[PDB]
Amino acid sequence: KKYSIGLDIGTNSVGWAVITDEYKVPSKKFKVLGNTDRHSIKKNLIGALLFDSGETAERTRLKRTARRRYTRRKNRICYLQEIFSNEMAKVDDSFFHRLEESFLVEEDKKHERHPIFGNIVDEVAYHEKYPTIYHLRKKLVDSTDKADLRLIYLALAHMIKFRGHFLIEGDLNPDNSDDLFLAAKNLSDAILLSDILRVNTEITKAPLSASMIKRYDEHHQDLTLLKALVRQQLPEKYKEIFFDQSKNGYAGYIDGGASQEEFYKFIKPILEKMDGTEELLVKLNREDLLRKQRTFDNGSIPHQIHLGELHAILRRQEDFYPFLKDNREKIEKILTFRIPYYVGPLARGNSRFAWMTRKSEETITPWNFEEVVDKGASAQSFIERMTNFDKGTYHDLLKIIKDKDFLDNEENEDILEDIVLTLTLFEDREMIEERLKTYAHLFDDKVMKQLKRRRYTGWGRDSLHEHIANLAGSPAIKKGILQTVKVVDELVKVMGRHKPENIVIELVETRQITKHVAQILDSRMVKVITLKSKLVSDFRKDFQFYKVREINNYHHAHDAYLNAVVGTALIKKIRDFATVRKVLSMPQVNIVKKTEVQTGGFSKESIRPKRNSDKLIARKKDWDPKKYGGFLWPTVAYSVLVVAKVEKGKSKKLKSVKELLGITIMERSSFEKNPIDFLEAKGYKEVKKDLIIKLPKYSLFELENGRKRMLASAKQLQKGNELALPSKYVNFLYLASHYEKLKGSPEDNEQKQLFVEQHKHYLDEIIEQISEFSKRVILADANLDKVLSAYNKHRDKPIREQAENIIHLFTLTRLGAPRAFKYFDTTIDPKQYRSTKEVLDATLIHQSITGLYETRIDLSQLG
RNA sequence: UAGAAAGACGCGUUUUAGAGCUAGAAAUAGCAAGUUAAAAUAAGGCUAGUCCGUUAUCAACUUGAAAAAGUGGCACCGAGUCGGUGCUU
DNA sequence: TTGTACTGTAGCGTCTCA
DNA sequence: ACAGTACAA
User: Fold this and answer.
1) What gap in Å lies between CA A15 and CA A507, rounded to an integer?
2) Is A506 labelled as part of a ligand binding site?
3) Distance (Å, rounded) from C-alpha A769 to C-alpha A323?
4) What is the main EC category here?
């Protein structure tokens, strides 16, 4: 009539147990549903839940921020094109069209394949005249001659597509340098520009283009010297270095994927043993030898350099094109504008992150930003929304008031709370002034213009899904909480809604968890015990109950049992203690890997080159991956068992087939919108609508002779069986190791040290046990012959290392995916179950959250 | 020691553009050149925003657009992953 | 033409704020 | 986990 529940809480596992007063685990007969022969199974009330670790939201946050970055950059270029469109339609209406179609292949383009000029000779002449865009930028800054609008748009679009960082708040004009306050400020500008820019010998308003043009010319002359020198000294490696793109040469540096430092470390011995390269070595040691222009170290350039160059070109070209003079400040705004950090996304109430408030409901652009956005309300909403609700100044403001008695004034101190509220919340000078506006008449101008600098820091301290969705903490650590609440719900469900007298659970987080599960007694209709792990740890050492975590997953459920037993024993206090030995040795433990649908990214993110394979994913709707390339390795959401007719053969025949097919994550929406039509799109005919079965990852299949296999994907399986050793074997395998810390005392505990050699033969029987279980459910032959041979050739080694590598040997047997393991001195290579045909006639198992209730679907009776 | 949200930057990848020349029946061989740009950066979605799209939730079966609710006897002896016995309606 | 065995492939660095 | 090459039918 009385039962207790032991719970072990972890990132991946929730061990559960049902304990009676003699510490017995009851064994009860459960109705099993489904079309199979059985209608009753017998299973023990002890088990473990296994699931994948939960994911933190950091990756999703970075991906969302990158998405917003690309969206706003494309919007910047769209603004610039919108400005230039009226004038540029007069000369080349198709110019922007060719720019957007530059990605397409020659037959797919709606205009000529040369984007900038639309004809071969002009494009070749432009590339010869300006080898890079930086040559064009320097030419437009320096020369006062009229320029074509295509070239000016190219320079400006390169300016604002890649505008550089915003870590500088002043002006930082690039021509300032390479009354002590102003001299010190300008010399600070000089030291930062010397960190950014190397040298400018002949003065120009475009020092970045000058320095990188020097970089390009130096690279050209040094490559010419390298070609001549390698031809004159080492003709056999010329083919290697300047043609082979795979051997990390200069050809690998340019055409291949070699970065700067690997190319340097490859070329350095080459320029060391051959002579005449002292300048080349000293340039390599400066990391200035054959540099590119677009380089990883360009993150240091402030946006003010690009802004100065852009201002220079528009001052040069305003008289030729008065259209630029009409809206010069607009293009300068497009470079210099940035969404404020406190505003947030510019939504219209549709985001789940946005908090901004707008005044006048026009579309927000660079130019009307400060007159449409209520900066005050948005800025205070930034700071109020993430500060938690509730569960010195006596000597400091004396300076500002210049009086202590008026600091001790009592009547008007609510607004005095509210000024320090303002300067604890806000930071911006104008915006602190705008929220400080309220108190203007109480004080003369100098004292609040001094007082606004007084920055303050610090702060003084239903449905179940929505009842947990409001909780604090990371989304990764909460998964065990949701699963444990659901396991408790089912364990009270199983026994006619009889509450347990005591449940025992596994620092500050679990102190909060104890209260959160304690609120259930009045929120959701159970003496919860906050058991410390140390008590179970020394108790498990005080007796024979050693664990070796490398063997199997049963020790989760065993730890749940130990939790329940120690908790009920504890509450009962500078036949039962006889029962515990039997209950540890039980071979049947309900272990459930949680069937969960994979959610996440479409595939591995690297875009593969063009290939003739049909497994490349189209990275855009029109972009056929035969020609354009695309992604590989899509993530499957879940498998789907489908029975249908498929025509096969040149003389096609409507042959019936049963197989499972994988739904990838982006096909999931289209499949669940209309399953049959998606399946017919895949080539299946007369699909049986009601016979379709959804199969998530870790779907469990039971096969003949008790073999269980777990489903990893539509094309891959996992081992789904666990071996249980007798506890004596586990005790030998534990006590064969840890000699420097096992005994704890030097001579009384010696029988633990002596225990292993008088039972060395257990290791031989454990060998036969592993072999019998591998002919049972692993069915690996060659790997078994390998491990038997390796055991026979090393069986006389000292006992500690033998037992440690016997512990290593259980990777062959452990639940989950097969993996390589070293044993003594040889890698036993794993095997991969790429054969899902064997489960299309097996017994599909649907397991409840505890795994007690089951549903058995015999697939061979379908179709 | 780590959790959530916002604003940015620089690379990288992919396709195209940057006329390769000479000897060539050709296979290929010698020679020249290489640094840059455009576009995309989850397919896309509709509430069409300079917004949203990788976090969280998810056995089966019956209702419910969904939300959400409901659906499976006991005692004993054994233990190769659970087996059987008897009582019960 | 359809399954098995063996080997290879897999986005990232750096900020600023309350 | 999936892709690609290399073979057994």
Assistant:
1) 19
2) yes
3) 87
4) hydrolase
Amino acid occupying residue A68: R
Domain residue spans of chain A = 4-52+477-573+575-592, 59-91+130-234+274-336, 393-451, 603-716, 720-841
How many Å apart are A456 CA and C18 C1'? 11
- Any idea how long chain A is? 863
Q: Which of left, alpha, beta for A686 (phi over 0: left; psi -120 to 50: alpha)?
A: left
Residue A504, classified by CB atoms within 10 Å of its CB into exposed (0-12), middle (13-18) or buried (19+), is: buried
Furthest CA-CA distance within chain A: 104
Q: Are A831 and A691 in contact (CB under 8 A)?
A: no
Helix (H) or strand (E) holding A480: helix A479-493
Residue A124 host element (H or E)? helix A120-129
CA dist., res. A684 & res. A643, Å (int) = 9
One-letter identity of residue A385: R
- CA-to-C1' span, A844 to B66 (A): 29
Q: What is the resolution of this structure in A?
A: 3.0
* Pairing assessment for the beta strands A854-858 and A843-847 based on DSSP bridges: antiparallel
Alpha carbon distance A837, A713 (integer Å): 13
Which residue in this structure is represented by tokens 């069915």? A779
Q: At CA A175, angle to CA A171 and CA A178, rounded to 5?
A: 100
**Selection from A157, A144, A169, A178 nearest residue A306 by Cα:** A157
CA distance linking residue A186 with residue A172, whole number of Å: 9
The answer to whether residue A148 is catalytic is no
A246 touches strand C (CB under 7 A): no
Is residue A669 within 8 Å of A625, Cβ to Cβ?
Answer: no
Residue A8 assigned as binding residue: yes
CATH of range A4-52+477-573+575-592; options 1.10.150.120, 2.60.40.10, 3.40.190.10, 3.30.420.10: 3.30.420.10
Residue A222 marked in a binding site: no
Chain C bases having any atom below 7 Å from a protein CB:
2, 4-5, 7, 9-18
How many CB atoms neighbour CB A183 within 10 A? Answer: 9
Nearest-Å Rg of the Cα atoms of chain A is 37
- HSE-CB of A597 using CA atoms within 13 angstroms: 13
Please tell me what DSSP assigns to residue A704: G
Q: Cβ contacts of residue A465 below 8 Å, gap of 6+? A: none
* Chain D bases having any atom below 7 Å from a protein CB: 1-4
Give me the residues paired with residue A574 across strands: none
Spatial distance between the Cα atoms of A495 and A491, rounded to a whole number of angstroms: 7
Pairing of strands A693-695, A13-19: unpaired
DSSP string, A427-443: --HHHHHHHHGGGGGGS
| A555 labeled binding residue | no
Contacts of A611 (CB under 8 A, 6+ apart): A625, A626, A629
Identify the CA nearest to A680 among candidates A708, A642, A714, A710: A642
Q: Which nucleotides of B are covered by protein (CB under 7 A)?
A: 2-19, 30-44, 47-60, 67-69, 72-85
Chain breaks in chain A (C to N over 2.5 A) after: 178, 391, 461, 506, 525, 573, 574
Contact A476, A59 (CB under 8 A): no
β-bridge mates for residue A631, sequence order: A617
Q: Is the Cβ–Cβ distance between A700 and A693 less than 8 Å?
A: no
CB contact at 8 A, A14 and A483: yes
Q: At what angle do helices A207-233 and A278-285 cross, to 10 degrees?
A: 140
- Catalytic entry in A8, A217, A428, A690: A8
If one counts every other C-beta atom within 10 angstroms of the C-beta of residue A422, the result is 19
Residue A143: phi and psi, rounded to 5, are -75, 145
Cβ atoms A15, A559 nearer than 8 A: yes
- 8 Å CB contact between A231 and A224: no
